[PDB]
Design an enzyme around this catalytic site. Structure first.
Site, PDB file in Angstrom:
ATOM      1  N   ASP A  13     160.233  53.446  46.978  1.00 47.91           N
ATOM      2  CA  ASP A  13     159.829  53.889  48.842  1.00 47.91           C
ATOM      3  C   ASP A  13     161.034  53.187  48.669  1.00 47.91           C
ATOM      4  O   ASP A  13     160.196  52.900  50.078  1.00 47.91           O
ATOM      5  CB  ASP A  13     158.204  53.853  48.540  1.00 47.91           C
ATOM      6  CG  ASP A  13     158.629  54.631  49.614  1.00 47.91           C
ATOM      7  OD1 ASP A  13     158.863  55.453  50.343  1.00 47.91           O
ATOM      8  OD2 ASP A  13     156.967  54.510  50.470  1.00 47.91           O
TER       9      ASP A  13
ATOM     10  N   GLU B 101     149.207  55.275  61.891  1.00 46.20           N
ATOM     11  CA  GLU B 101     148.726  55.432  61.356  1.00 46.20           C
ATOM     12  C   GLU B 101     149.759  56.527  60.686  1.00 46.20           C
ATOM     13  O   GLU B 101     150.375  57.018  60.498  1.00 46.20           O
ATOM     14  CB  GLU B 101     147.552  57.252  62.255  1.00 46.20           C
ATOM     15  CG  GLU B 101     147.406  57.967  61.619  1.00 46.20           C
ATOM     16  CD  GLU B 101     146.540  58.206  61.118  1.00 46.20           C
ATOM     17  OE1 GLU B 101     145.880  57.523  60.319  1.00 46.20           O
ATOM     18  OE2 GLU B 101     145.795  59.871  61.126  1.00 46.20           O
TER      19      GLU B 101
END
Ligand SMILES: COc1ccccc1CNc1cc(NC[C@H]2CCNC[C@@H]2O)nc2c(C(C)C)cnn12
Lengths: 279, 65, 286
Positions: free
Chosen positions: C113, C11
């Site tokens: 990232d 999640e």
């Protein structure tokens, strides 16, 4: 990069005839759905194409006065989205006034042009309730537009290739003393090429180079040596032949372009709103 | 079982683009806007913009659908 | 759809990832821009060391993305005490990361990232860059970006100084940090704030000078630090050879223009020297 892009792989077609086939399939399939649900209510494919040209002009000037100022890359992306969507969908099923706004809305996200939905819809000349209802319609159609684009969102436009050709001309083609005076007339010609189906038939680099050489011809400057000796096409003659043929074909697409007639559009819009009020 | 470098060979279907390093040598950088010191301190040079513009101008110029 | 759920994988605040049948499915503003960024970029990219987008579908203003299923990531490898990370393993991981990054950079995209848990590994030992929600095209003066990108521990000093314009260095620095994390098994520069991030960078690698970084002071959020001499790299990395130390030095050059690119890194003697990178099948499986 264009040379391994989804636009080149999937959204550059062989001929104008093929595009006509795709649009004919779209019109035919909506007609089949409409008869299978429940005559001259229907639009003919050339009527659909006339309406699509009208609404592409509407999209252009919506982006032109959009505040904050919209980059040209976003505008080109949105117009390409509009063209691609109506290759395989009928204006009788999905209204072009909603679809053009949805195309602008999605192109703003894809080209990383940060706009809030309120300030996006503030650009429409409508009462605030109408702005809200337009926004809801756009949000309803956003996923549909993306699905109909087959999730191909990066659009390679001719603008950066145009800039690159200007750089290469200034650096490597001195006999063109000032390539910059070619800009305006080339830009104009680009804007005309955009109204046609060329963006679905030619590479962005080919489009940019055609605009530049057409500008040079309007200024009566010949550029055959830029192609043959600078781009080194005198060493692969069939490449020069193919490139010259591509550029001539593009110039003829611009030559045989017919803008939507205002009486034509006035009638066809009544037919379109008749189609959408019913069904 | 040793490694050796081999550059990425991806067909551009267009004219040859000169390397980043050579752009100033060949006079290209005279026709792009200079990178500001703030841009340079972050690693952004005018060479990047020039190289990308040339690559886009030449990409797929010869390709047929 | 045609994909049956099998497991819940994770999640993140923008999406839920679940195994499906093997693929991984990632499920008033409209469709989310991180998902749109992932779609638009990964549709235009195809390389063995970049995560493959297999399909996208959905309903209403929601959307789901189909990806190749990945077994583990580099963070799990680093933190697993029972895995020995031989120099060949480190060479293999660095080689795959750099090849994926070289491909990404030629297509004028920055990942922005890079960190160990974004370097995913499949059952075949193939490393793939993932999580393109921050990735952005570069090379355009018309585009200005944000500086808070890249997780702090891997954020390059020009980003911490607030560079609004940058190139591949923001990736390469993170690569260096990842490399250091592979060598030390702990985060190289674990700052708890941006100022503390810069402090740790300068304490370890030395405070850069004007000669090291001529326009350093032009960055909008630049601020001066005490002259830290820095620790010589061979003291920090006591078991690395000279070739590896040269690679590390190249990745951590304070000058982003002088910082080695992915292509330049791949050409270094370290990768071509002995020992060779281990084949994917032989890489340690946690
Ligand atoms: C639980 O076991 C592990 C352990 C470590 C790594 C992977 C797995 C299982 N596999 C998996 C997890 C996963 N988590 C979502 C994000 C989490 C933050 N870092 C980027 C990740 O994508 N995402 C994917 C992908 C796609 C969506 C890229 C394909 N496999 N996979």
């Amino acid at each position: 990069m264009y040379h391994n892009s989804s636009q080149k792989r999937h959204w550059t077609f062989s001929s104008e005839e093929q595009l006509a086939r795709l649009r004919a399939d779209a019109n035919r399939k909506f007609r089949c759905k409409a008869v299978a649900n429940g005559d001259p209510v229907f639009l003919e494919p050339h009527e659909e194409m006339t309406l699509c040209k009208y609404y592409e002009k509407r999209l252009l000037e919506f982006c032109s006065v959009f505040k904050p100022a919209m980059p040209r890359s976003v505008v080109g992306t949105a117009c390409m989205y509009f063209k691609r969507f109506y290759l395989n969908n009928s204006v009788m099923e999905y209204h072009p006034r909603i679809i053009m706004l949805t195309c602008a809305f999605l192109a703003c996200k894809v080209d990383e042009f940060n706009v809030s939905s309120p300030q996006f819809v503030g650009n429409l000349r409508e009462s605030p309730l109408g702005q809200e209802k337009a926004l809801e319609q756009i949000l309803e159609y956003e996923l549909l537009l993306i699905q109909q684009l087959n999730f191909h969102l990066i659009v390679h436009n001719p603008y950066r290739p145009f800039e690159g050709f200007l750089i290469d001309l200034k650096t490597r083609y001195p006999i063109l003393e000032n390539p910059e005076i070619l800009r305006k007339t080339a830009d104009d010609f680009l804007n005309r090429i955009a109204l046609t189906d060329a963006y679905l038939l030619y590479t962005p680099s080919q489009i940019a180079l055609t605009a530049i050489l057409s500008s040079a011809s309007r200024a009566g400057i010949t550029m055959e040596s830029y192609l043959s000796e600078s781009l080194m096409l005198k060493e692969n003659r069939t490449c020069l032949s193919q490139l010259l043929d591509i550029m001539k074909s593009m110039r003829n697409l611009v030559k045989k372009y017919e803008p939507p007639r205002s009486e034509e559009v006035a009638v066809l819009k009544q037919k379109l709103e008749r189609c959408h009020s019913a069904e | 079982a040793l490694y050796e470098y081999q550059p990425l060979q991806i067909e551009t279907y267009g004219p040859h683009v000169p390397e980043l390093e050579m752009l100033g040598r060949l006079g290209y950088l005279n026709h792009v806007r200079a990178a500001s010191p703030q841009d340079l301190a972050g690693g952004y040079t005018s060479s990047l913009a020039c190289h990308r513009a040339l690559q886009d101008a030449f990409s797929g110029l010869f390709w047929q659908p | 759809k045609r994909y049956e759920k099998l497991d819940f994988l994770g999640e993140g605040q923008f999406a839920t990832v679940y195994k499906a049948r093997i693929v991984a499915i990632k499920k008033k503003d409209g469709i989310n821009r991180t998902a749109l960024r992932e779609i638009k970029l990964l549709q235009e990219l195809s390389h063995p060391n970049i995560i493959g987008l297999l399909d996208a579908f959905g309903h209403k203003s929601n959307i789901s993305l189909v990806f190749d299923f990945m077994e583990t990531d580099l963070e799990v490898i680093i933190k697993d005490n029972s895995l020995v990370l031989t120099p060949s393993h480190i060479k293999a991981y660095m080689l795959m990361t750099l090849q994926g990054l070289e491909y990404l950079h030629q297509h004028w995209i920055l990942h922005r990232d890079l960190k160990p848990n974004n370097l995913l590994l499949d059952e075949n030992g193939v490393l793939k860059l993932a999580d393109f929600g921050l990735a952005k095209s570069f090379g355009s003066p018309n585009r200005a970006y944000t500086h808070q990108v890249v997780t702090r521990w891997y954020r390059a000093p020009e980003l911490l100084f607030g560079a609004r314009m940058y190139g591949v260095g923001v990736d390469m620095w993170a690569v260096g940090c990842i490399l250091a994390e592979l060598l030390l098994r702990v985060p190289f520069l674990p700052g708890d704030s941006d100022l503390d991030q810069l402090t740790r960078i300068f304490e370890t690698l030395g405070t850069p000078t004007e000669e090291q970084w001529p326009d350093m002071c032009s960055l909008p959020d630049y601020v001066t630090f005490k002259s830290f001499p820095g620790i010589p790299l061979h003291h920090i990395f006591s078991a690395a050879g000279d070739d590896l130390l040269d690679l590390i030095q190249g990745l951590f050059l304070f000058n982003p223009c002088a910082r080695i690119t992915a292509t330049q890194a791949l050409k270094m003697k370290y990768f071509s020297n002995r020992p060779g990178p281990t084949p994917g099948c032989q890489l340690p499986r946690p």
